[PDB]
Chains A and B, each alone.
Chain A
Amino acid sequence: KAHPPELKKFMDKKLSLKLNGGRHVQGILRGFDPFMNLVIDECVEMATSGQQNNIGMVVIRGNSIIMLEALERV
């Protein structure tokens, strides 16, 4: 009943992701599932301070992803 999202196009691409709590994050998309949970790699926090921080190989819950933007050509 529940189909997977079409994010083959964005695989292994650097993305910038708008997230739930006014949080933004950026990194390389290594994988996904039908809830749109994402695996990001070499991911950077992009805190409001303007300061960026490196956490890598994160899991993002699909639920809390609003929009993603490709930084590199798809």
Chain B
Amino acid sequence: GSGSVKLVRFLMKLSHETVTIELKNGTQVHGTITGVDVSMNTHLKAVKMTLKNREPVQLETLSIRGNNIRYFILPDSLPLDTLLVD
């Protein structure tokens, strides 16, 4: 088809999905999304944050201001066509 109106609307559906986020500063976050927000601000639980060239660190919770996100790496099974009907 074509472009969605907004595509955050998709990310907002990914509650309870476990993802890996890369930040614009090289930090990698692996965690389970508790919520995503219109401004792409993103909340995770059960997080393993790995700042650039540092040893991982585990955290119960983390929120990331969305502008900092470069990308989400999604679950291989995540049913895209389903979730994209928007």
Whether the complex brings A and B within 8 Å at their CB atoms is answered no
Where the two chains meet, the residues of A that have a C-beta atom closer than 8 Å to any C-beta of B are: none
